């Protein structure tokens, strides 16, 4: 489970989306495992503006939070699932690093703020679905 409150908009992993978030639906990508979310109230998560490839991301499965080097934004095949058939999943950061299937939703940052969420994982790797493209998320 996570989420990056940022301004009107909640960003969960849309493999993980509520009722209310589907209701209240501003934009969705099953390619990017993402799903944004209108909100009321104010979210103040600074989102990076970015090409680090090095940061924190939090392992709920561990109760820590882990520094990793990840990969850059690619196109990378995931196993199949109950959410998804066999495919390459677009935008898509490797690192190695503990994972299990709980801790998506967990936050990646970098020095200039939130670089994206836990998405995929495996083997000793941990794969994180970027944001810092959406520059829509600010306006
Ligand atoms: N984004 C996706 O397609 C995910 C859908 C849910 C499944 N998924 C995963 O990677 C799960 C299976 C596993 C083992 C260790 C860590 C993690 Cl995060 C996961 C892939
Ligand atoms: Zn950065």
Same mark, same amino acid.
């Given at each position: 489970? !996570? /989420? ?13 989306? +509520? ?19 209108? *909100? *009321? /109230?104010?979210?103040?998560? +600074? ?6 490839? *090095? $940061? ?13 080097? #990840? ?5 990378? #095949? ?7 058939? /066999? ?9 190695? $690093?503990?994972?299990?299937? $709980? ?11 939130? &670089?994206?969420?836990?998405? *995929? !994982? !495996?083997?000793?790797?941990? $794969? #994180? /679905?970027? &944001? ?8």
């Amino acid at each position: 489970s !996570g /989420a990056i409150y940022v301004g009107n908009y909640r960003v969960v992993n849309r493999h993980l989306a +509520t009722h209310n978030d589907w209701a209240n639906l501003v934009w969705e990508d099953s390619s990017r495992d993402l799903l944004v979310s209108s *909100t *009321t /109230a104010q979210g103040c998560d +600074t989102i990076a503006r970015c090409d680090c490839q *090095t $940061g924190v991301y939090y392992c709920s499965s561990r109760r820590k939070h882990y520094p990793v080097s #990840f990969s850059k934004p690619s196109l990378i #095949f995931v196993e199949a699932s109950e959410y998804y058939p /066999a495919r390459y999943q677009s935008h898509l950061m490797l690192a190695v $690093g503990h994972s299990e299937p $709980g801790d998506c939703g967990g936050i990646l940052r970098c020095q200039h703020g939130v &670089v994206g969420i836990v998405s *995929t !994982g !495996g083997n000793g790797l941990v $794969g #994180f /679905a970027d &944001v810092r493209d959406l520059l829509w998320l600010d306006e």
